[PDB]
């Protein structure tokens, strides 16, 4: 377990296991003080005598540290100078049991070091977005709205009616970068809000007054009302200074919110 590995030429294995004639597997349970997001397990065999390297390694992980669960079938490890077992899906692990198979051609198993690499939930050690967020839909909508300008109008008209679309785009606008830069979200909100006056007023209410949704219904409770960023400021300015039939009404709404606030 020592953080500093032994010398690469350390002539004696730091740890050795003598196999009884009827024993095929030896086990090493590493209990951690608290659960961590385990991502990789590194095992360093004694490089001077690789005949004592385990033939295979079966990794079991316990999130609670009590009920071990094999990650997969044992990995063939004979002939490897370094054993790097990467978990494709990081697993919460408070204990790790390594079951090392007797070497093919040796009665003793020699190991140098075991590393359990990973992360903690918080602290200094806590170091495809589209797949884990809803941003892909917004990127699709932005592509439809902006890729072909001549169709923008139609696209916006098809997109404006859907309930809670503007609230959702505003929520994605104010969230930390999640695979879509804020300017594209701003473009979506502005182009949707400009296709008719009613949704311009709704968007103004969302940005200034009430951004909450209008167990399956969208809620969007997570964000404070009226919060401003460079994004909201740009959206509001383009709405105000855009020349169209609704311009007057939008300005009216703005002034209304001003008076209400005062």
């Amino acid at each position: 377990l020592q953080a500093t590995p032994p010398h690469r030429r350390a002539r004696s294995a730091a740890w050795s296991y003598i196999f009884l004639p009827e024993e095929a597997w030896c086990d090493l349970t590493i209990h951690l003080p608290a659960a961590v997001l385990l991502k990789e397990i590194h095992i360093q065999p004694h490089l001077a005598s690789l005949a004592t390297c385990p033939s295979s390694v079966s990794v079991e992980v316990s999130a609670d540290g009590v009920n071990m669960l094999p990650l997969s079938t044992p990995v063939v490890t004979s002939g490897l100078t370094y054993i790097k077992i990467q978990l494709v899906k990081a697993e919460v692990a408070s204990a790790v049991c390594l079951r090392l198979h007797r070497p093919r051609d040796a009665s003793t198993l020699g190991l140098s070091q075991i590393k359990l690499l990973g992360l903690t939930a918080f602290g200094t050690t806590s170091s495809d977005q589209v797949s884990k967020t809803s941003i892909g839909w917004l990127r699709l909508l932005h592509h439809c709205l902006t890729h072909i300008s001549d169709l923008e109008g139609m696209m916006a008209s098809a997109a404006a009616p859907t309930a809670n679309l503007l609230q959702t785009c505003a929520a994605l606008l104010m969230s930390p970068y999640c695979g879509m830069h804020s300017p594209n979200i701003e473009v979506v909100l502005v182009k949707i809000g400009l296709q008719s006056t009613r949704i311009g007023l709704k968007l103004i209410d969302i940005l200034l007054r009430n951004c909450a949704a209008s167990l399956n219904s969208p809620l969007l409770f997570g964000r404070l009302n009226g919060l401003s960023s460079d994004s909201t400021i740009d959206i509001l300015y383009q709405l105000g200074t855009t020349q169209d039939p609704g311009t007057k009404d939008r300005i009216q709404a703005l002034l209304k919110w001003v008076s209400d606030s005062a």
Binding site: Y177, P183, L227, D230, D234, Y237, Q238
Partner: protein
């Protein structure tokens, strides 16, 4: 709302916009505040809302600015009762309203310029009150003269009158003239400008005319800032101004040149900001800085009479500044001159938190005053009255005596009446000797002199130093100190060209004989090189100076 609160600033920006739409509302505003009892909140609100052409015109026509200025002057010399606590709020109020060029002209007008002297007299009060008033006054003057030639002239005149240098006045001079001018730049673009922005919340409450969103930006940059730096702060992109319609601006113009053009193009002087558009003549002189205006009135000579970088170098700079026209030669390197001026005022920082010695091109500072003085002397010939005037004042202040003392200390000679560290010190001293010899030669024979000049140069270390240096029989040794030997030969030629200084060459082991021997050595070396077959520019120097010195000595001997 309480004063200075950002929300109050935003509400006041809304009021400013409404006043700009309905100027008459502004009149109503002033009616609602009593335009007497003006609180600091009233002043803040009026200053914010008054930032419009119509609004500023009505504010001026209300008489409130005049009443405030007169009341402040009356307070300083001790129609509204003004106390010391309201002075700083009133100075800030005047500063904010002076953002407009019209109010900037008014504050710099005849009726108000007495208030400037009143404040300066008042400061040259409780300690906290005095500090607040000092800060407000410095800010007020900086705003008044900011890119405003008329107010720069007025403040320079007031300061010159004040002097006819420690405490508040030194700080004021350092902050106002010894710091680079900063102008607010207003950038418009047809496309958003994202560079320089942070995703976090930032409340930049500027004047609404500076816009909002990603297509508008407002920067506060030194007038020395190049346009390329401005663009790099926001992002091929080209900067345009409405006045210079349809003509791309070079990216290296710098804001001083742009201001020169805009004032040439009738932009009102003291306009709050430079409004450029981001779309997609270098010889023009930069606009005169407050330091340049102040010096153009002969202020730098006045400063010198009231005054690692060697201390002796600083003393020499302080002494040379008293000469007529030395300041004009000095200001050809604006940044280095500013650094030196800060140095002589007991300030080591270059105004941006960086120690001057650790600043860029600090190695030219130690010898810069002498180079400037040599340039000054070289352009003033004996025949013109100015040459005699300059030489006489140089002798009077003690420039020649100090030069000779430095020569004695640096060449290690005396008046006639680790390893690498020592080597580099010797090399620096050799450069000092070279520059001093060139300075003396220019002072003698610029590119007439007091008859007592020979007495000084004879009682000086000059003769021992020249005699020791001329006793060199190795031409290769001369090749290793080409600048020093070139300066020595120039001095010998200048002396031999002045019959009243020639006696310094003939025996008092004369210098001229040593020069002749060095000429013989160089000719023999050249003959040896021919037989074998930076001395290139040095091998004619020795010949020419030897020929001239020998001719002068022979002419003198025939004269005898």
């Amino acid at each position: 709302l309480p004063c200075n609160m950002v929300l109050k600033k935003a509400v006041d920006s809304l009021l400013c916009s409404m006043c700009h739409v309905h100027p008459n509302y502004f009149s109503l505003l002033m009616g609602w505040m009593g335009i007497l009892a003006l609180t600091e909140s009233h002043l803040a609100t009026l200053a914010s809302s008054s930032q419009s052409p119509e609004a500023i015109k009505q504010l001026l026509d209300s008489g409130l600015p005049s009443l405030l200025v007169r009341s402040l002057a009356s307070f300083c010399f001790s129609k509204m009762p003004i106390t010391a606590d309201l002075v700083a709020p009133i100075l800030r109020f005047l500063t904010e309203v002076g953002n407009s060029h019209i109010m900037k002209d008014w504050l710099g007008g005849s009726e108000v310029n007495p208030l400037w002297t009143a404040l300066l007299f008042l400061l040259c009060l409780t300690t906290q009150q005095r500090t607040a008033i000092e800060n407000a006054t410095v800010a007020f003057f900086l705003q008044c003269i900011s890119c405003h030639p008329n107010n720069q002239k007025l403040m320079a005149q007031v300061l010159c009158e004040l002097f006819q240098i420690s405490g508040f006045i030194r700080r004021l001079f350092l902050q106002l003239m010894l710091e680079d001018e900063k102008v607010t730049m207003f950038l418009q673009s047809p496309c958003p400008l994202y560079k320089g922005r942070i995703n976090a919340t930032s409340h930049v409450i500027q004047h609404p005319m500076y816009g909002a969103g990603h297509k508008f930006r407002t920067l506060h940059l030194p007038v020395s800032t190049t346009l390329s730096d401005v663009l790099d702060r926001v992002s091929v992109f080209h900067l345009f101004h409405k006045l210079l319609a349809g003509q791309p601006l070079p990216a290296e113009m710098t804001l001083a040149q742009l201001l020169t053009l805009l004032y040439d193009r009738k932009l009102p002087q003291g306009y709050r900001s430079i409004d450029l558009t981001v779309k997609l003549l270098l010889e023009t002189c930069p606009i005169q800085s407050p330091l340049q205006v102040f010096a153009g009135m002969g202020g730098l000579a006045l400063i010198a009479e009231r005054l690692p970088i060697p201390a002796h170098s600083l003393a020499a700079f302080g002494l040379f500044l008293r000469l007529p026209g030395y300041a004009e030669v000095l200001l050809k390197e604006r940044k280095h001159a500013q650094c030196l001026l800060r140095l002589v005022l007991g300030v080591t920082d270059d105004g941006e938190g960086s120690h001057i010695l650790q600043s860029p091109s600090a190695n030219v500072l130690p010898t810069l005053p002498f180079h400037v003085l040599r340039s000054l002397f070289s352009t003033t010939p004996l025949t013109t009255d100015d040459g005699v005037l300059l030489r006489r004042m140089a002798l009077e202040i003690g420039a020649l005596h100090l030069i000779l003392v430095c020569l004695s200390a640096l060449s290690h000679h005396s008046p006639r009446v680790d390893v690498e560290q020592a080597l580099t010190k010797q090399r620096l001293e050799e450069e000092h000797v070279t520059c001093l010899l060139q300075v003396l030669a220019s002072y003698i024979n610029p590119v007439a002199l007091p008859s007592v000049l020979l007495e000084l140069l004879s009682q000086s270390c000059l003769i021992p130093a020249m005699s020791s240096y001329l006793r060199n029989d190795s031409v290769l040794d001369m090749a290793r100190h080409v600048p020093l030997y070139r300066a020595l030969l120039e001095l010998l030629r200048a002396i031999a060209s002045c019959a009243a200084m020639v006696p310094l060459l003939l025996p008092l082991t004369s210098v001229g004989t040593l020069l002749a021997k060095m000429k013989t050595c160089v000719d023999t070396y050249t003959n040896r090189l021919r037989s074998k077959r930076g001395l290139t520019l040095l091998v004619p120097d020795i010949q020419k100076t030897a020929e001239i010195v020998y001719a002068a000595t022979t002419s003198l001997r025939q004269a005898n």
